[PDB]
């Protein structure tokens, strides 16, 4: 018999992104080659099968730094991290291959789906 | 020029609630009289003006335990904590006064709004 506030989930995510921008309560740095990205472990797990696996691990759950595979593109990661915190994906001709490869590695199935559909339309 | 995934914010919130149920990465206990509630500080701040103020405070941000005012009803808090993590509010005749008072204390304006409208309809 609950009532539901339609905009609540979006409002929560907007405030989680504000916390990220102000670097409040971030508990991990994701290292992608020469670049560093601060984030909240809980948001990373909620968006990514890879981070869900990493941060449920009894040893990795306590790490303050996570290094990604050297093949991972920093811009692709940046675009996906922005998506995690906003629901918005900056998908462009010049970045689609890097975004899809990063989304496959991060196990972000809905992003992989759409990248596949956008590539198929151009061939 | 971004594209947007409609269900992303709801999917994130569902996974944050799964983390709460499994007690993964919870970093605070909220004490309401004889009852204890584990939560994520980031979600509490994102939903409540009171917790936003508390956890941006340079001393309170590091506390693992927060005690609420003894006038706060544990069931009212429980209903509001469930709302924070699900967008669903279990608003009933028997709990509406406690829910509205707790929402005023927690500074959850949309919940206060609706409690006011539901009470006005019954008078």
């Amino acid at each position: 018999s609950c009532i539901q506030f339609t905009r609540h989930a979006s409002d929560v995510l907007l405030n989680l992104n504000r916390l990220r921008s102000r670097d409040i309560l971030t508990d991990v740095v994701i290292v992608v080659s020469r670049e560093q990205f601060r984030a909240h472990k809980t948001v990373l797990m909620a968006c990514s099968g890879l981070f869900y696996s990493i941060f449920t691990d009894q040893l990795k759950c306590n790490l303050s730094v996570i290094n990604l595979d050297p093949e991972i593109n920093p811009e692709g990661f940046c675009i996906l991290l922005d998506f995690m915190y906003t629901s918005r994906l900056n998908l462009r001709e010049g970045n689609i291959m890097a975004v899809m490869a990063t989304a496959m590695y991060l196990q972000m199935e809905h992003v992989v789906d759409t990248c596949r559909k956008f590539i198929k339309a151009s061939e | 020029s971004c594209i947007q995934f409609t269900r992303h914010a709801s999917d994130v919130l569902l996974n944050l609630n799964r983390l709460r149920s499994r007690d993964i990465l919870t970093d605070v206990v909220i004490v309401v009289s004889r009852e204890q509630f584990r939560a994520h500080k980031t979600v509490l701040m994102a939903c409540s003006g009171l917790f936003y103020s508390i956890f941006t405070d340079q001393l309170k941000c590091n506390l693992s335990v927060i005690n609420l005012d003894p006038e706060i009803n544990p069931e009212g808090f429980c209903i509001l904590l469930d709302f924070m993590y699900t967008s669903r509010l279990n608003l009933r005749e028997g709990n509406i006064m406690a829910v509205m008072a707790t929402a005023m204390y927690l500074q959850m304006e949309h919940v206060v709004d609706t409690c006011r409208k539901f009470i006005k309809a019954s008078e």
Binding site: C2, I3, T6 | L89, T114
Partner: peptide, 4 residues
């Protein structure tokens, strides 16, 4: 607010 809605009836879900």
């Amino acid at each position: 607010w809605v009836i879900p």
